[PDB]
Every structure is written in structure tokens, then in C-alpha cells.
Symmetry: D2
Subunit: 142 residues, 4 copies
């Protein structure tokens, strides 16, 4: 089994304040589950080869997803910003598989990824524990 | 816009204790978002014609989903029990649309639904406010 | 150190839905901390001889406190109902110490406590793990 | 009644991740209640003349309290850092009243407060809505 524990840091009040509005788990590797403990969010998965997505919305209306998973025994992550209301995590998560439009960024097995939304909000996923079955990462909004 | 606010009541410690492990929103009607306030869970949707699903897991390993939405301006709900680990909410939610295997129970536009899992856990969704754009319902595990 | 993990069961929608509105920790035994994990609430204490209180309010306005702690290496609990708005947990917790009017109930070291409020809400605290440093209890609103 | 809604921003992972470990409400002005909604924390009070405290602990073990309230119809705030484990919020909140050693800081009715802890963690409380009965503030760990 694999687990990924996320700590969420929001740096800049100017960018608004984000909260989770959706949490999905992909059906590969025997699925998995999100849980919360001490302000953190942990994705527990039945094995290597699946993932999950957290969608955030700011009190300014901005919508973004954070994807984390394990691909061939190595952690991966991605961030998608500038989402329309209809582009829910339910739509996004499957796009990393079956030759979907996001599978390429899963295949990179990134230990860190950052991007800045068209509206000017910076986002970063950085793994602090990059090896083993108990993975850790920070999610930073700025 | 439509919103559905859920209060979760767990009645019987013998059945274990459930917590949310996944939350999905379907992409119709301009999507939607889950939010938590005062222990309750609210699904806010851009209009009539979409839905969302909460998946629960008990500390005894039992997995079940609760689906709520609005179909042609009337509320609906459903409960699916006896799920395998790979049957995530991500898999379940879309099954209510595109002539999927659960669309029939969405079309009923039920104001109340109850079922008992094969392992003996009772589940009920009962709307306390059944009309208008601000819908309310209790979710009861027993 | 000692810990007490609580699982909250709410059995009867007719009594309203309760949520936590305050959490205190008494300052003996090197204090302690409340944390949430998987829908449960854990009080971690620096040793034997302290306690904490959760105050709950129903959406019908009813106010009650649940007290749990360790006294001379044995778990204790109490429930106070019919609280006025000014009787916050900050007022209640200390009443269990220093000639306070509730000290006697700490001294009982109860592994179970039941009480019904004047307005008719049943409350129970029942420890499921009653020995050791990792205690567990169900809190039942009926 | 008065309310104060807090949004918590954590800017620097190097200082560790903070979570709430205690929430108190002082017993003047008919008391009050803490509630969570969309990742924010609201203290609702029965009138002017009371307050509440959130105690935070970082995963590095640092302990700090944030106090907010209304004094003579104006918002106030304070931050106390370098707390020992036994200095719980239950100890801190009352120190703002009755010849307590922190009463002076309530009397200042500050709309902003900044302080850096001895171990090097910056803390700020900044009200974004500074007038009326529905107050708003950002809490920034830097
Ligand atoms: C070892 C590993 O990470 N494999 C990845 C695949 O995961 C497997 O997928 C199958 C279903 O096809 C099944 O669910 C297995 O349990 C699961 O481990 C899969 O994610 C592919 C997708 O391109 O990547 C790896 O091969
Ligand atoms: C009015 C209503 O509830 N209509 C339902 C449909 O919802 C619409 O779906 C389309 C896409 O096909 C689009 O997203 C609209 O915004 C949305 O209102 C749809 O849910 C169907 C599915 O069978 O049922 C109703 O017709
Ligand atoms: C062993 C035990 O539970 N003792 C209880 C006391 O707790 C001790 O309290 C002192 C106070 O200075 C100190 O904080 C110790 O750390 C702590 O163990 C205390 O709760 C008394 C209060 O009546 O009851 C027990 O003796
Ligand atoms: C108007 C106001 O903020 N007054 C403050 C006091 O609050 C009053 O306190 C009394 C105490 O009996 C009572 O609870 C009232 O409801 C409440 O408004 C109190 O906080 C004092 C303490 O120094 O400061 C102000 O005067």
C-alpha cells in the first residue's frame, strides 16, 4: 500500500483564500481513500498505479486541482489551474489515464511541480519525502 | 443555482464508525462544489441537472456511497452499499448518467431512500426540505 | 502521556444536530492538545492528572459539555446538560478541580456515564478501551 | 451579537505546519461559539464584551495563541508566543480580564497585531473588516 500526506500552505491573502471543494480517487490499484488528520490530507492507495485529486476554490472564485499519485513505484504530481466550473475533479482525474490529455505529466514521476495561473496565482507541489511507501508533500498557494 | 445540505447521523456503534473518504461532483449544469459548515456538508450546483457523491468508509472496512442531486427541478438521492475498494465515488457518480446502471434511481426523483447492506448496516437519506433551491436532508447510518 | 479518542454518534434527528463549539484543555500534567483525525477527536495529555472538555450546540440551540480525562491513572468522564450560553467550556472545565462543584465526578473515574437533559436529550460517554495509555470512547447523543 | 471570521494563512513550510489544538470562549456578553465553514473559523458572541482564543501547535512543537474579541464595540486581538505545554488556551483567555496580566492588550482595541516568537516564527492578525457586527481577519504565520 501507498500513502501521500499533504500539508497546505497559503501564502498571500491578496490571492484570496482557498478551500477544498472536491476529492476524487482513481479506480486502479484497488482504489484508495482520502482522510484528514491534524489539518493534513492523506491519500491512501491499495498499491502503485493509481492517484487522487483535490479541487480547491478561492473566495474569489478561482478553481484549481492538485493531483498526486504513484506511478511504477515513484511519486508523481500535477497542478491544473484556470478551470471552468464544469471541469470538476471528476472530469480531471481520469484524464491522467487511458491516454488522456494529462497522462504525460503523470509519466514524468515529478517530485516537484509549480505553475502560475493566468489570473496570477502561483501553485506548487513539493514532496518532502520522495521515497518509500509513506510519502509526504507540501502544497503551496501564493 | 441549487444547494443540498446534509446532516450525518450515526446511530449504532455496533456497525462501526464512518467517515468521508471521497467527494465528487458531476460536470453537468455547470458543475458544483462541496463545502463544510458546522458539521454539515453542502453540495452547491450551478443549476438543475447535476449531482454529487459522498463515499464513506467505516473503521470496520465497510464502503458505501451517498448520491444527491437535482433532476428536472426535483431533488433525488440514492445509496450504494457493499462496494469493493476499486469502486470509488469517481466510478459511481457517472453511472447515474449517459444511460448508466444507476440512472433509473436518479429518474425517480426520490425525497427519501433507504437500504440495508449485505453486511447488515442500514442507510437512509431523508430530505427534510423537499422543495425550492435550498434543499436539506438527513443521512442516517444504523 | 495519555490519549483519549472519541467517536461521536448522533442517533435521533428529532433532537437536532450537534456540533462542537469549543474545546478546552486543563493545565495539569503538562497540558495537552485536541486533534481531529478521520472524523474522530483525540485529546493527548502530557501525563495522568488532567482533562479536556468539548462543548456541543445543537441546531436547535441546546448546549452541553462532555468532559474526559485521566485521574490517578484511570479514565474519567462527565456530561453537563442544560447549560446557559454564558456557561462556556472555559467555565466548566476548571469546575472539576480545586474545590470546584464538579470535582467529585472526576474522582469517580467512571468508564461510562449516562444522563438525559431537562429538554429530553439523552447523552452517553462509554469507554470501549478502558485501560492503558491509549483510551477510546463513544459519545452518544440519543 | 458580534462575529469574527478568521482565515488562516501559513507562508513558510520551514517554520512547520500549524493546526488548532484548543478553542476557548470567555463567558461575558452571553458567551459565544466557534464554528468552521469553508476552511474559515468564526467566533459568534452574544454581544460586545467577550472574546475567544485559538491555540495552535506546529508539527515542530511550537505553541502559540491567537486572541480575538470585541471590547466596547470595537474589535481587539493579541498573539502570545513561546508558550509552555501547560499554558493552555484555558489559562490564557482569562488573563485578558480581571487584573489579568494581558488585560491591557484587550483595552487597545487593535485592528492589527504583529509579533515574532523567540524561535523565529512571525505571526500577524489583520482585520480586513474592521467595523460593524460582522468582523473579518486574516491570521498569518510567516
Ligand atoms: C506498477 C504500476 O504502477 N503500474 C501502473 C498501472 O497500475 C495498474 O493498473 C492496473 C489496471 O490497468 C491495475 O489497476 C493494477 O492494480 C495497477 O497497479 C497503471 O496505472 C498504468 C497506467 O498507464 O501505469 C502503470 O503501469
Ligand atoms: C433541467 C434538468 O435538470 N435537465 C437534466 C439534464 O441537465 C442538463 O444537462 C446538460 C448536458 O446534457 C447541461 O449540463 C445542462 O446544463 C443541464 O441542466 C441532464 O442531467 C439530463 C440527464 O439525463 O437530465 C435532465 O434532462
Ligand atoms: C497522578 C494523577 O493523576 N494525579 C492527579 C493530579 O495531577 C497532577 O497534578 C499536578 C498539579 O501540580 C501536576 O500537574 C502533575 O503533573 C499531575 O500529574 C491532579 O489532577 C490532582 C488534582 O486533584 O488529582 C490527581 O492527584
Ligand atoms: C460594552 C462592552 O464591551 N463592555 C465590556 C464588558 O462586557 C460586559 O461584561 C459584563 C460583565 O458582567 C456583561 O457580561 C456584559 O454582557 C458585557 O457586555 C467587559 O468585557 C468589561 C471587562 O473589563 O469590558 C467592557 O466594559
Amino acid at each position: 500500500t501507498y500513502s501521500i500526506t499533504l500539508r497546505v500552505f497559503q501564502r498571500n491573502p491578496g490571492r484570496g483564500f482557498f478551500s477544498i471543494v472536491e476529492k476524487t480517487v482513481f479506480h486502479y490499484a484497488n482504489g484508495g481513500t482520502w482522510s484528514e488528520a491534524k489539518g493534513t490530507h492523506t491519500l491512501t492507495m491499495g498499491g502503485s498505479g493509481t492517484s487522487g485529486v483535490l479541487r480547491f476554490m478561492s473566495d474569489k472564485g478561482e478553481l484549481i486541482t492538485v493531483a498526486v499519485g504513484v506511478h511504477n513505484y515513484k511519486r508523481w504530481c500535477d497542478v491544473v489551474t484556470g478551470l471552468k466550473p464544469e471541469e470538476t475533479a471528476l472530469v480531471i482525474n481520469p484524464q491522467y489515464y487511458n491516454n488522456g490529455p494529462r497522462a504525460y505529466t503523470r509519466e514524468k514521476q515529478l517530485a516537484e511541480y509549480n505553475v502560475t495561473s493566468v489570473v496570477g496565482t502561483r501553485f506548487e507541489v513539493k514532496y518532502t519525502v520522495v521515497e518509500g511507501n509513506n510519502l509526504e508533500a507540501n502544497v503551496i498557494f501564493s
